[PDB]
Design an enzyme around this catalytic site. Structure first.
Site, PDB file in Angstrom:
ATOM      1  N   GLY A  27       0.463  -5.182  -3.056  1.00 50.29           N
ATOM      2  CA  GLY A  27       0.460  -6.604  -3.354  1.00 50.29           C
ATOM      3  C   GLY A  27      -0.487  -6.960  -4.476  1.00 50.29           C
ATOM      4  N   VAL A  32      -4.137  -5.631  -3.695  1.00 49.26           N
ATOM      5  CA  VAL A  32      -4.212  -5.051  -2.355  1.00 49.26           C
ATOM      6  C   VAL A  32      -3.552  -3.676  -2.345  1.00 49.26           C
ATOM      7  CG1 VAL A  32      -3.608  -5.299   0.086  1.00 49.26           C
ATOM      8  CG2 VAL A  32      -4.223  -7.323  -1.267  1.00 49.26           C
ATOM      9  N   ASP A 160      -5.115 -15.661   6.526  1.00 48.25           N
ATOM     10  CA  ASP A 160      -5.045 -16.397   5.252  1.00 48.25           C
ATOM     11  C   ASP A 160      -5.526 -17.844   5.387  1.00 48.25           C
ATOM     12  OD1 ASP A 160      -4.151 -14.134   3.962  1.00 48.25           O
ATOM     13  OD2 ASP A 160      -2.235 -14.994   3.310  1.00 48.25           O
TER      14      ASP A 160
HETATM   15 MG   LIG Z   1      -0.413 -16.088   3.137  1.00 41.56          MG
END
Ligand SMILES: [Mg+2]
Ligand SMILES: Cc1ccc(N2C(=O)CCC2=O)cc1
Ligand SMILES: [Cl-]
Ligand SMILES: [Cl-]
Ligand SMILES: [Cl-]
Ligand SMILES: [Cl-]
Ligand SMILES: [Cl-]
Length: 342
Positions: A27, A32, A160
């Protein structure tokens, strides 16, 4: 200090402790990689922050994210497995890496055939995590299916946290469909009640298979919301701080709250009751996470001796005015003081 090794993966230099093996990009605020952690046996996500100290705003955001992740210790919330830097001193400190459990499916990748028992268990876990988060006076702000990780045994974690641009909230976009109206339109100072609106939107979508308020823009979405819950009365209108927003609301023809049993056809009557208590326009009158855990819809799962609250959380830094190098030094202290979980 562990030994570090360096490698270039997709035009980026990664320098990480030897314990982390078989790095694989997955990602791209940072890049990531997935990896195997030989110390714990877990598959992990390793995030290298992008330009963490480029401006005062960015340096404070880096500090905010690390403080929050270090604090969260709950079964239904993402926790911090490790944080590291290859720097050997504050003078050479530039890069920050964050390590978490590697997540597979999110709730979208399940929203399959859901029984009412599945909806009970999933929403119960969201509320259990939110009771913990809210007890530390933290507001998530961005709850939606893509921010909920779920495994094969229907076990769920919130991730998140809200730490979004005007462009990202424009048009026919899932980034806005779960937001409470008072924050979508800047009606007033918001508080933790915005997260309960989002849970109601998520629960409705698990019961019907369809987005509750898929507006094509801010105004279309408001019209969908007011058709279901009714136009505001004078009591809520007095709490809206913008004269312009008050004026716009009063331009709409008045509508009554709909019958939720005729919207959510065939749903558990106890699920209908809970939705009516979450999806309330006036945020002062919404049910809280702690109150919702005791609702009869969750009778099979509720255990008041196993729904913990958080340690106190000091957010006084949020009103502090510091220079870039001062935020950077605070972040460095938090990196080197990290103690891993059991
Ligand atoms: Mg998210
Ligand atoms: C349009 C729509 C679609 C699905 C549902 N529904 C529920 O709420 C529970 C089971 C079910 O099928 C209700 C309305
Ligand atoms: Cl190592
Ligand atoms: Cl975790
Ligand atoms: Cl560095
Ligand atoms: Cl989503
Ligand atoms: Cl604290």
């Amino acid at each position: 200090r562990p030994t570090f090794y360096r490698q270039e993966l997709n035009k980026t230099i990664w320098e990480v402790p030897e314990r982390y093996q078989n790095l694989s990009p997955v990602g791209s605020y940072g890049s990531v990689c997935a990896a195997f952690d030989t110390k714990t046996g877990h598959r992990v996500a390793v995030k290298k922050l992008s330009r963490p100290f480029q401006s005062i705003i960015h340096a404070k955001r880096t500090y905010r994210e690390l403080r929050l992740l270090k604090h969260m210790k709950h079964e239904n919330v993402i926790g911090l497995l490790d944080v590291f830097t290859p720097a050997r001193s504050l003078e050479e400190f530039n890069d920050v890496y964050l390590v978490t459990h590697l997540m597979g499916a999110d709730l979208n990748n399940i929203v399959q055939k859901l029984t009412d028992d599945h909806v009970q268990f999933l929403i119960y876990q969201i509320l259990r995590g939110l009771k913990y988060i809210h007890s530390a006076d933290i507001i998530h702000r961005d709850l939606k299916p893509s921010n909920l990780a779920v495994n094969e045994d229907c076990e769920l974690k919130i991730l998140d946290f809200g730490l979004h641009t005007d462009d990202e909230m424009t048009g026919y976009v899932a980034t806005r469909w779960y937001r409470a109206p008072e924050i979508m339109l800047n009606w007033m100072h918001y508080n933790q009640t915005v997260d309960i609106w989002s849970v109601g939107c998520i629960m409705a979508e698990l019961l019907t298979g369809r987005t509750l308020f898929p507006g094509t823009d801010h105004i279309d979405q408001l019209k969908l919301i007011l058709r279901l819950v009714g136009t505001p009365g004078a009591e809520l209108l007095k709490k809206i701080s913008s004269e312009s927003a008050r004026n716009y609301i009063q331009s709409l023809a008045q509508m009554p709250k709909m019958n939720f049993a005729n919207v959510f056809i065939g749903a558990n009557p106890l699920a209908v009751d809970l939705l009516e208590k979450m999806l309330v326009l006036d945020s002062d009158k919404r049910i809280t996470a702690a109150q919702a855990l005791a609702h009869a819809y969750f009778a099979q799962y509720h255990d008041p001796d196993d729904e913990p609250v958080a340690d106190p959380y000091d957010q006084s830094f949020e009103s502090r005015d510091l220079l870039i190098d001062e935020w950077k030094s605070l972040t460095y202290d938090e990196v080197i003081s990290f103690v891993p979980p059991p």
